[PDB]
Amino acid sequence: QPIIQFDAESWEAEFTQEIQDKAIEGLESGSVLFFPKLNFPLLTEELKFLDPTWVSGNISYDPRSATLKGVEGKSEDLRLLSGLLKRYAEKTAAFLHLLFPFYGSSLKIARTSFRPVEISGRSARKDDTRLHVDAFPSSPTGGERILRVFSNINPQGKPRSWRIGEPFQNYLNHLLPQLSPPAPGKRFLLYLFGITKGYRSLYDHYMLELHDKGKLDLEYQKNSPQVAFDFPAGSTWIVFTDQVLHAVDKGQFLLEQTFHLKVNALKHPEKSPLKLLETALNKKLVSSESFKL
């Protein structure tokens, strides 16, 4: 069940335990949780930002530090834009705490993003029209999960077209023969040189290889099992993007919020990419891992 549909229409929705169960089981199994009626409204004063020219170098906001990046302009405009992204951070965070009480306080918010550039007009590694799991060369996770909340805020009713691929285990299996260990010492140099933020764990190395090799595998991109789904304007969806194979084909105006979650906070840690990779390669893939006696 690549997509599980939910009825919630409010960011302050109260959830029964049955729906909370459905959500966590689905999320952890690598489904997209889809909320067709959960719209994220904009203030009249924010409507001006529905314009791709605000991107100056893909605008980001760090709720932890209340800092906005990737955009230039007058102070008042940056203030408004920061307010928009801040509100998205707040609402998504509240919603996740209402929906996933099992995770308790283990949900750690990360960066908020506003994507006002049209997708259809968009290197092979960066081509997000190619199925991939999320892995960022400059930003290793150390095994932590990448959980994202997305909202289509297109004011012309245009959907956001995605493709959803096969389960992670199948993707990993398909690509296994192409995986290779890192060159000795190379990850340490990336760290010393500031190319990576923190040290790239072996887990991160392998997720990057899956991401990259998968994107270059043209036969796989073309022929692997995948479903095309249009997320309507005014909808929201929630995905472990390090586990769900995904690609975006068209659309414009998206808010996105990243959260991180430690593997030991999961209901079924064995389903995580970290544990699946550690099992497949029979080794510990993050050196900083906690040790269970």
> Number of H helices and number of E strands within the chain?
7, 11
Instruction: Classify strands 236-240 and 145-152 as parallel, antiparallel or unpaired.
Output: antiparallel
**Do 52 and 154 meet the contact criterion of CB atoms below 8 Å apart?**
no
160 is in an annotated binding site: yes
From 13-21, 30-38, 133-141, 197-205, give the range in contact with Fe ion by CB under 5 A.
Answer: 133-141
174 is in an annotated binding site: no
Output the smallest distance, CB 267 to Fe ion, in A: 23
Instruction: Classify strands 3-5 and 32-35 as parallel, antiparallel or unpaired.
Output: parallel
Q: Which tokens hold the place of 137?
A: 């060369």
Q: Is 212 in the site for Fe ion (CB under 5 A)?
A: no
List the beta bridge partners of residue 60. 69, 113
- Site for Fe ion (CB under 5 A): which residue of 134, 144, 242, 278? 134
From 64-72, 130-138, 182-190, 274-282, give the range in contact with Fe ion by CB under 5 A.
Answer: 130-138
Q: Which is nearer to Fe ion, 20 or 224 (CB)?
A: 224
Output the smallest distance, CB 50 to Fe ion, in A: 22
Q: Which is nearer to Fe ion, 87 or 111 (CB)?
A: 111
Side by side, the strands of the sheet bearing 227-231 are 227-231, 160-164, 246-250
Give residues 41-70 in contact with Fe ion (rule: CB under 5 A): none
From 129-137, 227-235, 271-279, 284-292, give the range in contact with Fe ion by CB under 5 A.
Answer: 129-137
CA separation for the pair 81, 90 (Å, rounded): 14
134 is in an annotated binding site: yes
Q: Which is nearer to Fe ion, 134 or 166 (CB)?
A: 134
**Do 206 and 129 meet the contact criterion of CB atoms below 8 Å apart?**
no
Q: Which is nearer to Fe ion, 136 or 191 (CB)?
A: 136
Q: Which residue has the tokens 């390669």?
A: 281
Instruction: Classify strands 227-231 and 32-35 as parallel, antiparallel or unpaired.
Output: unpaired
Please report, in range form, the residues annotated as the binding site for 2-oxoglutarate: 115, 148, 160, 162
List interacting residues with Fe ion (CB under 5 A).
134
- Feature table: binding site for succinate: 115, 160, 162
